[PDB]
Amino acid sequence: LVTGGATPELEALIAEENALRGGYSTPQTLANRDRCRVAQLALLDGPFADLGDGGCYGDLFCKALKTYNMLCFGIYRLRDAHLSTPSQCTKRYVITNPPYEFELVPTDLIFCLMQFD
């Protein structure tokens, strides 16, 4: 998850020379780019924007997985979103694996795994 999909074979090639060598692009190597990456998506101006206004987390997860094959596994939520009074705090906290009935707010970020495009 954290090393960018480093394979033991690449480790062996590094060990053979203690360096990273370039290589001409081939279909087999150009097909290695097709792996998911960690990303954060906002709900302001996108296909899921209408989900932000009180929509359930499960609906967003199912829609993302079905349409774009993005795996949403956490919410990055403003620390003062639950407060009724306005606040200037920009800091956010982490809510990993929310349940289906979780309610969203438009000012939320989604932790997701995106396929290569």
Binding site: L1, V2, T3, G4, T7, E11, A12, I14, A15, N18, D34, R35, C36, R37, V38, A39, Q40, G58, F61, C62, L65, K66, N69, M70, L71, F73, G74, I75, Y76, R77, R79, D80, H82, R92, Y93, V94, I95, T96, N97, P98, P99, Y100, F111, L113, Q115
Partner: protein, 352 residues
């Protein structure tokens, strides 16, 4: 034996002197002032005296008897003072941590070696001997060639019921036999993250791995490593079988990978750290951010074999069905192929 022999000889000689003097009398008193003491009674008198007990039931009455008793007191005290320090504190020395671990049946145990100090042991015990951990039946056995200081001794005393320590070197086969490395579930090697030469310390850890695998090739070893390249040296040990549980945890690699993934998506490091860490259960009722955050913190990460009902279905379908029906989130799969070994695929596409 010299001590015992000289002590018994002096005891018997003094008893004989007292017997001879007491049974005879004072020559100036015309041999009239005499007392009837058996030799064994004199032995009893001498031992009662030399213990500074002095019952008074048996004692010397003649002038020569009292004089010899006083000189026996003086000589015994002088000999004791001049003799006991050297010999007794030569003998009264015992090795504090030279014992051997006793393998209790039905109780697994692991052996922890490497850099063992206050900080490393404290961190390892906090992560391992956590209160929130329920089923921990393993006993931790530290093996290190440096005797612990006061703080480490106190820390070991605190966890005396599950933590033991032994003074030995993992590179010594005798010390490996002492801690019963054959019956150990696993060997965990800790490195010091703060050293002038990380390469030399990594080489030392690899030396320890080589020694442990030489003694018993089938044990499972988890070793902390400082630099990424040095992990290559762990592939030159034929006994090192990472497909059977042998693991190297590269501190720099994982640390900076967490940091870089946080750069890509901030807060990911906290999520990951909470996933594989154990947390005590805490209730928050007031509407705050802690209440929402703890609900996510309640989760952990597990591995499970997929049911045969899922076979033939694409990954998105299986994951969506698991989430909607089973209330589980499935993130990655272990794909085993004929061409290549098993590989971890995180969120594979619908083409799989």
């Amino acid at each position: 034996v010299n001590l015992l022999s000289i002590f018994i000889s002096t005891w018997l000689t003094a008893a004989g002197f007292i017997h001879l003097v007491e049974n005879s009398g004072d020559p100036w008193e015309n041999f009239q002032n005499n007392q009837a003491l058996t030799y064994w009674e004199c032995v009893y008198l001498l031992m009662v005296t030399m213990s500074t007990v002095g019952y008074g039931d048996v004692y010397a009455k003649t002038t020569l008897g009292r004089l010899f008793m006083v000189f026996f007191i003086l000589g015994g005290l002088a000999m004791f003072a001049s003799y006991v320090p050297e010999i007794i504190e030569l003998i009264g020395n015992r090795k504090k941590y030279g014992g051997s671990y006793s393998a209790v049946s039905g109780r697994k145990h692991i052996v922890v070696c490497g850099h063992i100090t206050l900080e490393s042991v404290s961190n390892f015990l906090k992560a391992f001997l956590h209160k929130a951990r329920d089923d921990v039946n393993v006993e931790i056995v530290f093996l290190h060639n440096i005797s612990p200081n006061l703080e480490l001794e106190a820390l070991f005393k605190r966890h005396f019921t599950q933590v033991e320590f032994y003074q030995g070197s993992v590179l010594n086969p005798h010390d490996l036999a002492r801690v019963k490395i054959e019956s150990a579930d696993a060997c965990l090697i800790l490195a010091n993250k703060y050293c002038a030469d990380p390469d030399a310390e990594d080489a030392s850890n690899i030396m320890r791995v080589i020694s442990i695998k030489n003694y018993h090739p089938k044990i499972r070893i988890i070793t902390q490593m400082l630099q990424y390249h040095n992990k290559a040296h762990l592939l030159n040990i034929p006994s090192w079988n990472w497909k059977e549980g042998d693991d190297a945890i590269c501190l720099a690699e994982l640390k900076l990978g967490f940091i870089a993934q946080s750069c890509l998506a901030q807060g990911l490091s906290t999520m990951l750290a909470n996933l594989f860490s154990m947390r005590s259960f805490i209730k928050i009722e007031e509407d705050t951010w802690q209440k929402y955050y703890l609900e996510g913190v309640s989760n952990e990460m597990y591995t499970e074999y997929l049911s045969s009902a899922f076979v033939g279905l694409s990954f998105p379908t299986v994951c969506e069905l698991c989430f909607v029906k089973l209330k589980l989130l499935m993130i990655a799969i272990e794909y085993k192929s004929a061409n290549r070994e098993s590989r971890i695929l995180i969120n594979p596409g619908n083409h799989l």
